[PDB]
Amino acid sequence: SMEQVAMELRLTELTRLLRSVLDQLQDKDPARIFAQPVSLKEVPDYLDHIKHPMDFATMRKRLEAQGYKNLHEFEEDFDLIIDNCMKYNARDTVFYRAAVRLRDQGGVVLRQARREVDSIG
């Protein structure tokens, strides 16, 4: 149908906007702490601690399959990155600290993204 196509153009454009959002958030991680999945070879107990691992590469795979229906779903995954880190790692670690700084800096980007998603519809 023509409606299904219209719907698909909307999703494509959301994917376009979320791709730009993801790039802006990932720039706030210049150490690349959150770039890839925590290695289960190197942290073998990880899934005993963290039930839903997340990282920027995994988000990008979902994004490119157009697997985010709305900004809320995307935000859920970004929050997992931060929240998983802040639980597994102690306060006095470079990892925790990196997550705090990513959360604080990401807030700004995500604030305007929400406005853009509502604005453009």
Listed by start position, the domains of the chain span 1-121
- The Cα 85–Cα 33 span in angstroms is 10
Token look-up 């706030």 returns 28
How far is C-alpha 39 from the chain's CA centre?
Answer: 18
For the chain, the straight-line distance linking the first and the last C-alpha, in angstroms and rounded, comes to 21
Distance CA 81, CA 35 (A): 10
Alpha-carbon distance of 17 to 117, in angstroms, equals 8
Output the six-digit token pair for 70. 């709305």
Q: How far apart are CA 80 and CA 103, in angstroms?
A: 11
Tokens of 103: 């959360």
Distances (CA, A) of 29 to 21, 36, 67, 99, 115: 13, 12, 23, 9, 23
**Other beta carbons within 10 Å of 40:** 11
CATH number of the domain at 1-121, please? 1.20.920.10
Angle, vertex CA 91, rays to CA 86 and CA 97, nearest 5 = 70
Please indicate the experimental technique that yielded this structure: X-ray
* Contact in structure between 113 and 71 (CB atoms under 8 Å): yes
Q: Which residue has the tokens 């702490």?
A: 33
- Both tokens of 49, joined, read 């601690």
Q: Which helix (H) or strand (E) holds 40?
A: none
Instruction: With CA atoms as reference, report the closest residue to 86 among 101, 74, 73.
Output: 101
